[PDB]
Design a protein around this ligand. Structure first.
Ligand SMILES: CNC(=O)[C@H]1[C@H](C(=O)N[C@@H](CCC(N)=O)C(=O)N[C@@H](CC(N)=O)C(N)=O)[C@H]1c1ccc(OP(=O)(O)O)cc1
Length: 99
């Protein structure tokens, strides 16, 4: 296997916005480690001329989620959202960032 092209570690929210706005496709994303909420993860996605941010929420079972459906890993959250939208208003499917 190859390492996941979506994990950026502890990068600032503004830095994530700066690089995603330059990407050419809707759905281009990254997972980053939140500075505002230490220990947690955040999802940043490009759509149109904006960059949307989602908190990767945790429960007492250690599951990962954005809305209702629970996942065992960050990898499973990401993979599910490549075929199912992260939004109910717009069709936003996650796709790998271009290097
Ligand atoms: C300025 N306010 C926001 O960004 C708010 C983002 C939001 O509600 N986003 C929409 C989705 C994107 C949009 N519509 O622009 C939402 O309804 N999020 C839900 C679902 C979710 N899992 O984020 C929520 N706020 O619980 C919150 C946020 C806040 C913090 C953060 O981590 P860091 O602080 O960016 O590391 C990520 C997202």
């Amino acid at each position: 296997m190859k390492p996941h092209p979506w994990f950026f570690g502890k990068i600032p929210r503004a830095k994530a916005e700066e690089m995603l706005s330059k990407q050419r496709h809707d759905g281009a994303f990254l997972i980053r480690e939140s500075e505002s909420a230490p220990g947690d993860f955040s999802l940043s996605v490009k759509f149109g001329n904006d960059v949307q941010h989602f908190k990767v929420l945790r429960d007492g079972a250690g599951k990962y989620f954005l809305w209702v459906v629970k996942f065992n890993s960050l990898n499973e959250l990401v993979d599910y959202h490549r075929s199912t939208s992260v939004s109910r208003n717009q069709q936003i499917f996650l796709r790998d960032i271009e290097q």
